[model samples]
Target: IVGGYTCGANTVPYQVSLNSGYHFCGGSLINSQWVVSAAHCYKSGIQVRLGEDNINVVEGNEQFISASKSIVHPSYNSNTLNNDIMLIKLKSAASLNSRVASISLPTSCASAGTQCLISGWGNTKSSGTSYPDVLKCLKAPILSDSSCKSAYPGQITSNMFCAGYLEGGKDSCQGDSGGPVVCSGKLQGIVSWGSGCAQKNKPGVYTKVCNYVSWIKQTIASN
Candidate 1:
């Protein structure tokens, strides 16, 4: 998925809903019963809307799975936005139709310099507006551990990872939070935070999927 462009009709693969309306963010079907996303995205009145591209275009009786349970990492502090991860257990399994299928989570995260795909309705340019009705994607390069540590100085932590263009033209913005940051066709991170929408010296931060694997597996198993 590339950034700076809106998804064409029937292009976006999945949809997630909040009480207000539908949002165009990406989700991965880790299993028949579970979906993964960022913590902040799981608002009080959120629901998962899968199998449609256009928010207004609903076809084939799209799955409107109510969340049976949601588990946000205990350490997730909105102030610092640390451990910004969450999982949703659908009341029932979503049928695997042509329009809906499970997306894979990465077995191992990519190292620095690895290129990844980030998709959302986030703004293309840092200062520009967001595309509320359309889905957009972009390519971002993974930041090296040392580079990320240096970039944020005291802010970088083990629970987080950073990605985006260094020059600051491309990034995930306001509505893009809690969306997926995919790499090599697998989910590696969830869009979490940044200094702002996009800014020089401030790369987009994400929840490190690998670090929370145990919590995710345990949460799903117990549920």
Candidate 2:
């Protein structure tokens, strides 16, 4: 978990952990055989775990699965982080259950100032500290484009959006990349990159999901 506001067990079923050797990024179980994440979270032989709330505890709700393929956006820029998103095709479809269910993608653009939630097993403090054993979540509010641009300057492209608070406290932090930014009970954004853990006026940057709906559909169909 990254910051405070950790969700109780099984609150976020679509939450998926993408691990290669070890956990590197988070993801969303959008379909039975497909998972969406951040492109920069890429790694060969990456694995995925669904319906998982805690990493250490093997609860009855969790389901571990293997990934057969990973498709990163062609324009994913490690520097500017443009189009920082990806899809993980599981070797087998996840078994649907109360604790394991796919989340619905957004059909409409989420307006700024929308209240969202970010969950992951990222650092409790900043980097250098160990990640938490359980998944954590934090209440985040979407920032206006003008406000987001003010923080990231030219780095904030149209494909990206920002969320968090200016007062600084809660954020996704390192190792939390590729997580979901669920707003209004829908998948709105994907955690792509950010500044520090949680700095004043610097919120976490996420890949805008609304801008890539067609790409997601086309990729999965053609792949």
Candidate 3:
């Protein structure tokens, strides 16, 4: 479901691998006790692994913890992919270190054409299920809302935004869902969905983090 270059250790410390008895999706370590992900990343019997980029092997710096309560957004629609966000409460706090740190949330919307980075352990080939052992990242320039809406028709909305190329070949793919879309060192979006793996003219759609800042803060406060 994807294409990207390999990212070594300590590059994306806040990134996490969600294991539903398998490496299913990506997420962000917003804090030691909480992880922000896509609502669709959750199913059951999932655990969170931090401080590691290579999912196939373990290292001394890694922290494995049980997943507790999962809170999905109130208006999440699986069909239309609206409000595609969720959070995972860790049973124990993650130990902060150079290889384990939380990413800053965006305070403002990213301007269209801003260069951003998206990383995950998504498929490196066409099969989709085969994931890279290490984390991979790609640079995507933000697409204008007007251009994005035109490409996606009436499907794009305020709660979402777009990134990728007009000609395609570079974008996030399946198994990359819920991964952080970082711009200027702050999390600006989450890899939500796309027409397919980097299809031409169909830029990757994301859950616009700036649009949910208030709701995110309130949800965390109450939880």
Candidate 4:
């Protein structure tokens, strides 16, 4: 995340790293067996590391588990990135602890200007490679649907929203996709895409988690 600070240990207990020998994306521990992430981050042989604070070091709080199955939203579109949400079921249930807990789903839609916390092990630089081992976090506010549409005309969809400064600075970057965007202690957004890291009037776009809450529950219940 650009213009962010290193997260305190276990501060984002629900956050997980989507890896395959190396961290590639971030995900949220919605339950002991399911992780929510961006569909764009999907691939075979994914390792979900829960309660992870740093990627390069063994922090003891981490739990590395293989994905038993992965389900991408059927309505997901790659061209426009609509409904860009996915879920990966763990091969075995995670043993929850203080350092490993589930993040609650959003009870209601996040309104414009809602101050949210976004954390990830993504690149910190907008122009160069600088992925941090420690989780980086940023405080960003939700942009209005109208405002977001204005910023990316013909691209914004109901399933997506934008957050961060329009003037550019803080944002989720590469390796951050599929990470959590927590608002009022609920999973509000999933890092999906942005113009180019962070740029003027180009806030990071995220998959609207609230819109897929029902889908998430039903998928887990029946699958």
Best by TM-score: 4
Q: Relative to the unseen true structure, what is the Cα RMSD of model 1?
A: 2.6
Clashes of each: 4, 1, 0, 0
Worst 10 residues of 2 by lDDT: 1-10
- TM-score for candidate 2: 0.95
Model 3 CA deviation exceeding 4 Å by range: 126-130
| Better-scoring candidate (TM-score), 1 or 2 | 2
Q: Give each prediction's root-mean-square deviation over alpha carbons.
A: 2.6, 1.4, 1.4, 0.7
True lDDT of residue 221, candidate 2: 90
- Candidate 2, superposed: residue stretches over 4 Å from native: 126-128
Tens-digit per-residue lDDT, 21-97, candidate 4? 79989999999999999999999999999988878899798899999999999999999999999999999999999
Better of 1 and 3 by lDDT: 3
TM-score of each: 0.87, 0.95, 0.96, 0.98
Candidate 4 is scored at a TM of 0.98
Ten-residue segment with the worst summed lDDT in candidate 3? 123-132
Candidate 4 residues lying further than 4 Å off, grouped into runs, are none
Model 3, span 79-154: residue lDDT tens: 8888999988999989898999999888899999899989998876643456678899988889999998999998
**Tens-digit lDDT string for candidate 2 (1-223):** 3456768888888998887767788999998999999988888988898888778778878788899988998888888889998998999989988888888888987999899988888887855576787888988889999999999888899998999887777788887788889999889999887778787877889899988888888988997
Clashing pairs in 1: 2-137, 2-138, 3-137, 3-138
Which pairs clash (backbone N, Cα, C closer than 3 Å) in model 4?
none
For model 2, which pairs clash?
A: 1-121
Ranking by lDDT: 4, 3, 2, 1
